[PDB]
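Reminder to self: tokens first, then the designed residues, so the page reads top to bottom the way the pipeline ran.
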């Protein structure tokens, strides 16, 4: 399968919260993971709050998944040690908590140490950069940084440095990533990423690599821009690794000012449409750009954000249907799958 075609991780996000996508219940999904991939990311159950039950740490459910991975030929990318969204904040992660810095330290020290030897790499900090599309509280930019509870408590971006240093100390063997989205657009956020990563390097922070989520559409952003954004980050350091962490590809672009090039019906791309064929080319050109500009020895992996289309967080988005992944609703490989094969094989 796909993983055989590369010497770096070829991964997939797996569900474990019930319903049809749940990896523990779906033998068909289990079989795809074993045959095609050699790494998993937990789609949800390694987020911050999932490390607790009531007031105590609780690793039961995440240990089950990490063990499943080890028994079925998968390494694990941990997602994520520090991330702002309130649906996954531990209760300690509040401006009302005088003990915040102590509880932050305890979180990273405990979680990183717990998974040592079982988890290959981590998203240490995810989504520290400001994004206008993603600022529901209206706090605004602090010179490109998101003013999350971590930023507010630490009074600035020093929480990022601390998270990396603590993760390194707790598990010296893990590869430590900074992860974000929209940084492949080669616009304002890419610039803010350069500033963020340069500051960490200047401070001697133990960052091992940068993750690009790569939640893209079929035609936007341009492959030239994706390629140049990656190049800009590769150029910051002779060793910094690059990982594509959450790749998926929407056929529909609701942001293009054109409502006549949208597939509006679930039947449109059930069998065949121009969009599925472009999606093949799109997966292919992105994997090719990754290979061309990320040197051998610095390729941290490529991961797709789920197994089959109905499992995708983007199966519906902006009130439209979509088909974002490598396998269809009946778990059959799509043209997208072949695009990855062709890229990885040259
Ligand atoms: Ca459109």
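Designed residues (346 positions):
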């Amino acid at each position: 399968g796909l993983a055989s075609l590369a010497d770096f991780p070829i991964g997939v996000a797996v569900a474990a919260s019930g319903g049809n996508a749940d990896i523990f219940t779906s033998s068909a999904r289990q079989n795809i993971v074993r045959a095609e991939f050699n790494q998993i990311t937990a789609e949800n159950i390694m987020k911050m709050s999932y490390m607790y039950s009531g007031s105590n740490f609780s690793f039961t459910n995440s240990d089950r998944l990490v063990s499943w991975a080890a028994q079925n030929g998968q390494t694990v990318h941990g997602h994520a040690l520090v991330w702002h969204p309130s649906y996954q904040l531990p209760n300690w992660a509040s401006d009302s908590n005088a003990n915040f810095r102590q509880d932050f330290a305890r979180h990273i020290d405990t979680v990183a140490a717990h998974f040592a030897g079982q988890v290959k790499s981590w998203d240490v900090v995810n989504e520290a950069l400001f994004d206008s599309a993603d600022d529901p509280d209206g706090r605004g930019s602090a010179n490109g940084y998101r003013q999350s509870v971590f930023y507010r408590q630490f009074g600035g971006p020093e929480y990022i440095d601390e998270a990396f240093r603590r993760a390194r100390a707790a598990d010296p063997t893990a590869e430590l990533y900074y992860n974000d989205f929209n940084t492949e657009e080669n616009g304002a956020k890419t610039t803010a990423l350069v500033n963020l990563v340069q500051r960490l390097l200047n401070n001697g922070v133990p960052i091992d690599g940068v993750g690009f989520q790569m939640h893209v559409m079929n035609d936007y952003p341009s492959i030239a821009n994706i390629r140049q954004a990656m190049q800009k980050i590769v150029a910051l350091s002779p060793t910094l690794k690059i990982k594509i962490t959450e790749l998926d590809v929407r056929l529909n672009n609701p942001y293009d000012g054109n409502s006549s090039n949208d597939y509006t019906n679930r039947n449109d791309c059930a069998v065949s449409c121009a969009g599925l064929d472009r999606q093949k080319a799109r997966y292919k050109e992105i994997v090719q750009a990754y290979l061309e500009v990320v040197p051998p020895g610095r390729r941290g992996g490529i991961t797709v954000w789920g197994i089959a289309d109905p499992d995708s967080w983007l199966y519906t988005h902006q009130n439209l249907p979509d088909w974002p992944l490598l396998f269809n609703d009946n778990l059959q490989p799509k043209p997208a799958y072949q695009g990855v094969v062709e890229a990885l094989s040259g």
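The chain has one domain: 1-346.
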